Design a protein around this ligand. Structure first.
Ligand SMILES: CO[C@H]1CC[C@H](n2c([C@@H]3C[C@H](F)C(=O)N3c3ccc(F)c(F)c3)nc3cc(-c4c(C)noc4C)ccc32)CC1
Length: 119
């Protein structure tokens, strides 16, 4: 047993972290709201960017893995938490979106720890 200034390759991170991202995409219908960037104009919520200073969604995180924009695995993890925190901050606790956020966050919390241990 062993509970674990380092640099990983894009291929190393995709092999390790894409299966965790795919686990999120497979949660249906819970992932549908997180697949594309929030569009305040389409959704008629011009107050969105007054609460969320830094947008995040699954499509953005998929591009970053796919184009080698992550170098340490904690860079991927922070973006995913940014996505869930944004959603938890902006939406009311009673809304379907907040509860969808909570299910995704559970599913992420219960798979990322082992994956980190393997890197
Ligand atoms: C695939 O097209 C998208 C479907 C979800 C649509 N959507 C919708 C639409 C509008 C309506 F509120 C609604 O019920 N939507 C909705 C549509 C499909 C769903 F599966 C779902 F859970 C919700 N609401 C969204 C909310 C968010 C959101 C997130 C994530 N964090 O803060 C906010 C605000 C994001 C997307 C939302 C936008 C288009």
């Amino acid at each position: 047993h062993h509970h674990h200034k380092k640099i990983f390759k894009p291929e190393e991170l995709r092999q390790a972290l894409m299966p965790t991202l795919e686990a999120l995409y497979r949660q249906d219908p819970e992932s549908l709201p997180f697949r594309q960037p929030v569009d305040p104009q389409l959704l008629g919520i011009p107050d969105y960017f007054d609460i969320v200073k830094n947008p995040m969604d699954l499509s953005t995180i998929k591009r970053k893995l796919d184009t080698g924009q992550y170098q340490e695995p904690w860079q991927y993890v922070d973006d995913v938490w940014l996505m869930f925190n944004n959603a938890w901050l902006y939406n009311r606790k009673t809304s379907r979106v907040y509860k969808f956020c909570s299910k995704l966050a559970e599913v992420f919390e219960q798979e990322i720890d082992p994956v980190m241990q393997s890197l």
